[PDB]
């Protein structure tokens, strides 16, 4: 529609030809605001939290309602100019799987985004919090069960159909849980094709609607790959509304909201190319789709 690059591909070009991308990543470390995370740092917290070093602001943290203690290390991330809200989470615990089925059944959330592997790189990144076979999972210590209802296996992710229910009041709920199996750890996706498949499986579920509660999205930390999925779909939405999107500022105001959001330079540039293929969007979902090689 116009021949003339947008500023989002002009900066990119200039950004490779100048070789920029460290030191853009540099300012936006440097630019972010510090807010006060003192809950994640109470003792009793400490066996809650997987890294040292990553921790939900006080001011966007989500509570467990009506808990002895309400801390769990997800932020909810809240862009009002897109209607857009995120739980970005660490990968559960072993001790706070518990607290994550907990937090999606109050939350109202429809979909989990998982976009790790539990083992990267010899690494334990995530405990199994939902099961593979037909065996009924147990969370006796906030009162969840959850079943496999069905699943859809592509050669680098699976949507596991999960039945949620609250033991103490019998009550069920369809989870959509999306796993990514061939994100890397500080990694990228293998193209803007591959990942935007994935993000349109996801938005087309409905699970990212205004609708539902926000959609939980957690890797390891719940900063690297889910803020890049989490940039890519808010920058997307700003731009389909009509906004003229600054990514640099748009990333500085989701650190806002949970710390460190992106975490190489390379998931920076990622984000740039994912959100430049991504704004030409039914024909367009169809090429990402075969580009993807999801039935291999």
């Given at each position: 529609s116009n021949a003339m690059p947008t500023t989002i591909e002009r900066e990119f070009e200039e950004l490779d030809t100048q070789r920029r991308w460290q030191p853009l990543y540099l300012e936006i470390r440097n630019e972010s605001h510090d807010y006060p995370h003192r809950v994640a740092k109470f003792p009793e917290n400490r066996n809650r939290?997987?890294?040292?070093?990553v921790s939900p602001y006080d001011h966007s943290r989500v509570k467990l309602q009506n808990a002895e203690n309400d801390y769990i290390?997800?932020?909810?991330?809240?862009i009002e100019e897109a209607q857009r809200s995120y739980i970005l989470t660490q990968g559960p615990l072993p001790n706070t799987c518990c607290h994550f089925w907990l937090m999606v059944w109050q939350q109202k959330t429809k979909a989990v985004v998982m976009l790790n592997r539990i083992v990267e790189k010899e690494s334990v990144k995530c405990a199994q919090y939902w099961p593979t076979d037909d065996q009924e999972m147990l969370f006796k210590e906030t009162g969840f069960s959850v079943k496999l209802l069905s699943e859809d296996v592509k050669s680098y992710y699976t949507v596991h159909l999960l039945q949620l229910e609250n033991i103490n009041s019998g009550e069920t709920r369809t989870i959509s849980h999306f796993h990514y199996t061939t994100w890397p750890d500080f990694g990228v996706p293998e193209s803007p094709a591959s990942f935007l498949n994935f993000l349109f499986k996801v938005r087309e579920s409905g699970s990212?609607?205004?609708?539902?509660g926000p959609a939980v999205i957690h890797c390891?930390?719940?900063?690297?790959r889910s803020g890049t999925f989490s940039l890519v779909d808010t920058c997307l939405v700003l731009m389909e509304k009509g906004d003229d999107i600054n990514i640099k500022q748009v990333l500085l105001n989701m650190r806002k909201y949970r710390?460190?959001?992106?975490?190489?330079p390379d998931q920076l540039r990622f984000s740039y190319m994912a959100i430049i293929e991504g704004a030409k969007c039914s024909s367009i979902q169809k090429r990402w789709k075969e580009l993807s090689k999801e039935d291999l």
């Open positions: 939290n997987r890294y040292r070093d290390n997800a932020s909810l991330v809240d990212l609607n205004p609708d539902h390891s930390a719940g900063i690297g710390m460190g959001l992106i975490q190489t």
